[PDB]
Design an enzyme around this catalytic site. Structure first.
Site, PDB file in Angstrom:
ATOM      1  N   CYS A 114       7.554   2.274  -1.764  1.00 52.56           N
ATOM      2  CA  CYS A 114       6.940   3.590  -1.802  1.00 52.56           C
ATOM      3  C   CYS A 114       7.854   4.620  -1.081  1.00 52.56           C
ATOM      4  O   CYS A 114       7.428   5.267  -0.114  1.00 52.56           O
ATOM      5  CB  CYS A 114       5.552   3.474  -1.144  1.00 52.56           C
ATOM      6  SG  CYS A 114       4.608   4.983  -0.877  1.00 52.56           S
ATOM      7  N   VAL A 135       0.814  -1.210   0.000  1.00 53.59           N
ATOM      8  CA  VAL A 135       0.000   0.000   0.000  1.00 53.59           C
ATOM      9  C   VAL A 135       0.865   1.286   0.000  1.00 53.59           C
ATOM     10  O   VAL A 135       1.884   1.363   0.708  1.00 53.59           O
ATOM     11  CB  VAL A 135      -0.994   0.020   1.191  1.00 53.59           C
ATOM     12  CG1 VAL A 135      -0.210  -0.007   2.575  1.00 53.59           C
ATOM     13  CG2 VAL A 135      -1.970   1.188   1.061  1.00 53.59           C
ATOM     14  N   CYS A 136       0.447   2.264  -0.805  1.00 51.24           N
ATOM     15  CA  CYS A 136       1.229   3.490  -1.041  1.00 51.24           C
ATOM     16  C   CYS A 136       0.296   4.716  -1.010  1.00 51.24           C
ATOM     17  O   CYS A 136      -0.183   5.202  -2.046  1.00 51.24           O
ATOM     18  CB  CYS A 136       1.980   3.339  -2.356  1.00 51.24           C
ATOM     19  SG  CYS A 136       2.902   4.812  -2.803  1.00 51.24           S
ATOM     20  N   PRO A 137      -0.013   5.206   0.200  1.00 48.50           N
ATOM     21  CA  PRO A 137      -0.919   6.354   0.300  1.00 48.50           C
ATOM     22  C   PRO A 137      -0.289   7.599  -0.325  1.00 48.50           C
ATOM     23  O   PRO A 137      -1.002   8.436  -0.882  1.00 48.50           O
ATOM     24  CB  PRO A 137      -1.104   6.565   1.804  1.00 48.50           C
ATOM     25  CG  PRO A 137      -0.041   5.773   2.473  1.00 48.50           C
ATOM     26  CD  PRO A 137       0.465   4.723   1.521  1.00 48.50           C
TER      27      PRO A 137
END
Lengths: 175, 168
Positions: free
Chosen positions: B167, A46-48
């Protein structure tokens, strides 16, 4: 997929006013370009931050007549929870664009981005006003998308649509 | 194709010294990253400037340990002719990376970039040192690729390989 007619899905989405809507790709035909942004919500990948960055530039999509749609395999509840979560805690905030729930996985499957019958890969597609796929990118799963790059890609597609030019020569633009 | 092992191919190529050589993708495993640059030579869509720009950055690919491979459906003769053609007439000059001939279309087919069973779309793939596909892009046929963007993508992949950050 590029040059072919885009898969016309129907799915529930959560809009900028946190209303549950039916999102129908074909509704944008003859009206707007679409940018489909697929992503995973599992804790590993996940990459907000990328969503936050796209949202920061949402008016640039609006200025270009592009509907931005975030798409994941997760439920409307899961998206609402992500919007409501503090940024410091990994949330995305109340973003100003629609998040679509691909709960039966057919959207991710038909865009060739469904991993292991499980979740969507980091795919991005640009759909034109005729419903044709004009750009496809699938990023490495750990790597977020660069919104400025996406907007330049959109700019080039708009240019083709308005000028018909193939490969235009940069130096000559002016002239 | 991303996350999966790359389709291995063995094909003829025209190298930087204009010698016709065997290009075996699996030969780079454990050795180098590869960047597969598919393109049309079809008159309607041919874009010499993008090949020229990638060539201008060949030291960046070398510095990153990336083998750049141009791939199209056309013959070795066509590629040599294109290299020899003056720039002002649509040529690419004597580029310093290998141009692969996908004559039988099998490579383009297997990478899902064959258009109208005729020519390759503007696909680009990055393959890592394990032979895994780490990035896939297909540009609109009329739109050339941006080499600086490709190089940033490669940098990000290398950073993941060395750091393991998600990320960043």
């Amino acid at each position: 997929l590029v040059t072919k007619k885009a898969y016309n899905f129907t799915a529930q989405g959560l809009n900028k006013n946190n209303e549950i809507i039916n999102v129908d790709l074909s509704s944008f035909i003859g009206q707007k370009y679409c940018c489909l942004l697929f992503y995973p919500l599992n804790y590993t990948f996940v990459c907000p931050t990328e969503i936050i960055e796209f949202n920061k530039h949402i008016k640039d999509f609006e200025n270009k007549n592009v509907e931005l749609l975030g798409i994941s395999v997760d439920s409307v509840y899961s998206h609402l929870a992500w919007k409501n979560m503090p940024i410091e805690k990994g949330g995305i905030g109340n973003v100003e664009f629609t998040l679509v729930s691909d709960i039966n996985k057919d959207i991710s499957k038909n865009y060739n981005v469904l991993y292991d019958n499980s979740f969507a890969l980091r795919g991005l597609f640009i759909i034109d006003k005729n419903g044709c796929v004009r750009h496809q990118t699938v990023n490495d799963l750990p790597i977020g998308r660069n919104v400025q790059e996406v907007l330049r890609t959109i700019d080039s597609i708009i240019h083709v649509d308005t000028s018909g030019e193939v490969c235009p020569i940069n130096w000559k633009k002016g002239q």
